[PDB]
Amino acid sequence: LELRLKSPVGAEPAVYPWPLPVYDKHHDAAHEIIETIRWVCEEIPDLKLAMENYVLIDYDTKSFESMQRLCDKYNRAIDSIHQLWKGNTRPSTGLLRHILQQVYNHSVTDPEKLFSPEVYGETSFDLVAQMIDEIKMTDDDLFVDLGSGVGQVVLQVAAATNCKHHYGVEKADIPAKYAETMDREFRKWMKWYGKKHAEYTLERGDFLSEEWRERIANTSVIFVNNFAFGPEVDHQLKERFANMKEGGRIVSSKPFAPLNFRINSRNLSDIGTIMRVVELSPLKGSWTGKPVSYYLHTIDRTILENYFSSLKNP
């Protein structure tokens, strides 16, 4: 006893066992099935016409026969459209949130072990989407998320941008191990829907290691949730940022330098002498979520050059 969903692009079908799994108090595989069908009907208007009107209205999630009739009415509609077609784009924001939730639900089987990953789609997703729209990224950029956890920020950026590569680095054992499954599941679900993503790597490691010193120096876009970082972690990170190229950017949860930094003879060693800092917020740019702010730092050594020029030409 199981339920099968045919891929809109001919990939291997989605197979769910019966009884259907329960993910948490606010997610179960039954609603995942219904929402997957609905998203595929939105991205394929012909499928909407083939699909009978009543099917996605009159349903019982606690009835095998009911859930099978629903799955079959979608599969028969996929088959009809696939026949009509006889005679890979980026996902929409809406579809991506659903894909990430799907990937998470299938990857983190014991959620007890872990703004937590559970609520990523309900809080963090929209802020990250807002960050992707603000920090414009090209095919020349290299993206790194320092302390990537289960890897959802990396998967979101990689599905939205055209960076050469996207990296996620996590030191902790439990999230780094879950990231391995998230990676496999993300690639599997993206192929299922027939969606394109940029290249990405989720790896285990310490971003303060010698290996990561040259790697940070060659990154053009760093995303770092530094809210909980200690003084030594913060001080070492600033040391790594100081080797970055002009125009290199760091997007963080707490600024690394004062927003009002004014260079003088007593603060010449501060990171503020080689970077610009701006507070950005979805409330500044029609937002209705949390009143949050993120901080954009841009490597600019002219701050330091101008100070010296002013001393020589007063």
Ligand X SMILES: O=C(Cn1nnnc1COc1ccccc1Cl)NNC(=O)Nc1ccc(Cl)cc1
Strand partners, 203: 169
Interaction residues for ligand X, span 253-292 (CB under 6 A)? 253
Pick from 253, 242, 195, 187: nearest CA to 217: 242
Give me the least distance between CB of 58 and ligand X, in Å please.
36
Q: Establish if 147 lies at the interface with ligand X (CB under 6 A).
A: yes
Please name the amino acid found at residue 187: R
Q: How many helices and strands in the chain, by DSSP H and E?
A: 10, 11
Q: Which of 8, 91, 121, 149 binds ligand X (CB under 6 A)?
A: 149
Residue 39 phi/psi, 5-degree rounding, is -65, -45
Residue 240 phi/psi, 5-degree rounding, is -70, -40
Give me the least distance between CB of 294 and ligand X, in Å please.
4
Write each residue from 215 to 254 as x if it is in contact with ligand X (CB under 6 A), else as -, in one continuous string.
--------xxx-------------------------xxx-
Candidate segments 61-69, 148-156, 184-192, 266-274, binder of ligand X by CB under 6 A: 148-156
Interaction residues for ligand X, span 169-208 (CB under 6 A)? none
Q: What's the CA gap between 240 and 159, in Å, rounded? A: 28
121 is in an annotated binding site: yes
15 is in an annotated binding site: no
Q: What's the CA gap between 79 and 61, in Å, rounded? A: 24
Q: What's the CA gap between 234 and 237, in Å, rounded? A: 5
144 is in an annotated binding site: yes
Candidate segments 17-25, 115-123, 200-208, 274-282, binder of ligand X by CB under 6 A: 115-123
Bond from prior residue into 19 cis (ω within 30 degrees of 0) = yes
Judged by the rule CB under 6 A, the positions of this chain that interact with ligand X are 115, 117, 120, 124, 128, 145, 147-153, 223-225, 251-253, 294
The binding site for S-adenosyl-L-methionine comprises 120-123, 143-152, 170, 206-207
